[PDB]
Amino acid sequence: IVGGKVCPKGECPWQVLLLVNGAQLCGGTLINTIWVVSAAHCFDKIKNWRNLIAVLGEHDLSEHDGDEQSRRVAQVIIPSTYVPGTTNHDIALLRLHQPVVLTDHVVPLCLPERTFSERTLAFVRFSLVSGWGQLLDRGATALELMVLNVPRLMTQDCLQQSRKVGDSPNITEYMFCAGYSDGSKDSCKGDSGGPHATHYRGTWYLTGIVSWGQGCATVGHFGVYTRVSQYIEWLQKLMRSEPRPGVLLRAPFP
Amino acid sequence: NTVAAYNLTWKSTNFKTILEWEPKPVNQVYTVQISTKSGDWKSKCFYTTDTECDLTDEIVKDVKQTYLARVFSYPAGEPLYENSPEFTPYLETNLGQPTIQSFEQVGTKVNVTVEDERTLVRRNNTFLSLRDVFGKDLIYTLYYWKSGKKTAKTNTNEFLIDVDKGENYCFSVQAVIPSRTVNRKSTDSPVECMG
Amino acid sequence: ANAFLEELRPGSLERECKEEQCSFEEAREIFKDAERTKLFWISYSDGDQCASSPCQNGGSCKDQLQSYICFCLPAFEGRNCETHKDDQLICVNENGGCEQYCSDHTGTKRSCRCHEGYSLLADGVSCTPTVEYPCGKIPILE
């Protein structure tokens, strides 16, 4: 996170830490006890498929305070339409091998239904963004979970207020922009997959997956997030499907 | 398909704020949204075929705040939209035309009173007057003739001018907000003369 | 107005313009000066827009210069008090008042629902947790 604050222990309970071969990989979002939502791009150059661990209740990467729980991931499902190295459809669904236990420091974020998100949650300005990513472009990673509040933007605005970079990948209907254009705050490499949660009438919902941007907190560029609302029923259909053997699964979208 | 709205204009007088825009709907309907620079967007005028939206009840919750609005176009069979210029009520809302409440002759001095025209700002169901809203920022300006054209200024609603005990003077006032540089003066009221 | 032997008498704003309805000359015949007659006339001719009785549903109307202002009762709004706020109860409006999910309805009233782990209260809009760890809640703060 660039320009955020350390989230206090327990106030970002749906934050998951993805580890591959023991190393820190990406963030995620607990959606219930067995599933977590992440970004498809974290798995692009992953070779060790059965060496994927999901850690919850985590806060400080430099200590084990017995609040953290880890499970191995049995399945990562990405849309067949996603093309590695690119930008579109950057979403992944992981089936935890064993269900974690909801505790004071382990609670899932609510995955809303398409219309509530599309017509209601889409209009609350600020939403939270968190993770253990770089504290600035190419800078170091954080040890304690970091949070950031960022204002959402309609794509037309996002396009109207950004420096016209002739190589920038188009912002599709599967993503939305959010953050600041003055280079002060933004998600950053290492946070991908993490949650963008919107608060509404006493409850928190999953509205976006940290996905991409032109370098962290660049002037004239907002961070772009995966539009989770477009994948609600796809997410639902998959959570109802029997475990198709093999860890990776490129399910058809939709 | 649709066509994005355009020429979104704010029209405001005594806080009755109404957003207008073009064009006239032809196989499309509109929806408007309002918000302060950093607040959640509130939808008003749902699927309206009209080219205007009454935003008074929203803007009068804090007249000193700055609001931006947008107008969406939906096909009548993210959508297109256009943002409105920004509008800070307190500094841009038009001061209606004033109204001389009376003009009592006290000896050689004559007292002219301007009535506090009601604004749309409410408080406990009641409507605050222009003076409860602007306070010391509101200056009323009196014009009076006997061939002549004299003026006077007051930071209340009453004037006391020296009339030549010999003729029937005439009046007309103007509300002025000195601090402004935009819509700082109102249209002159209807002329009132002593019979 | 002008009667047989009235203009033999010097003009009068009440008698001629307030009492009776005057013309532009008659007013000019009174105020004498062009600009003085103009100033009076611009207000004397740009009528009472509230005459067409344009403010509906109980609103009051303040006339203006080729315009007016409507002051509406609490449950109404719009340029002429046409909008009934009581009728705006649709999901695209404050999530239809629903705490969580709002289902819009045509002839029927909007109906609220909830997310797994919550239950709709009796008020028909609120949701209460049915389980110890409902989804969008931070235990340490709750």
Ligand SMILES: C[C@@H](CCc1ccccc1)Nc1c(F)c(Oc2cccc(C(=N)N)c2)nc(Oc2ccccc2C(=O)O)c1F
């Ligand atoms: C998705 C794809 C499209 C290609 C592309 C990449 C960049 C720009 C346009 C297209 N490419 C990528 C990203 F978009 C990306 O995005 C952001 C991630 C977080 C924050 C960002 C920000 N807000 N600045 C931007 N991070 C990427 O890699 C990481 C490298 C080092 C460490 C962590 C990384 C990671 O997290 O995956 C990456 F490969």
Ligand SMILES: C[As](C)(=O)[O-]
């Ligand atoms: C949203 As963009 C083009 O600034 O990166």
Ligand SMILES: [Ca+2]
């Ligand atoms: Ca730890």
Ligand SMILES: [Ca+2]
């Ligand atoms: Ca006459």
Ligand SMILES: [Ca+2]
């Ligand atoms: Ca006459």
Ligand SMILES: [Ca+2]
């Ligand atoms: Ca007469």
Ligand SMILES: [Ca+2]
């Ligand atoms: Ca008469």
Ligand SMILES: [Ca+2]
């Ligand atoms: Ca004459």
Ligand SMILES: [Ca+2]
């Ligand atoms: Ca005459």
Ligand SMILES: [Ca+2]
């Ligand atoms: Ca008039």
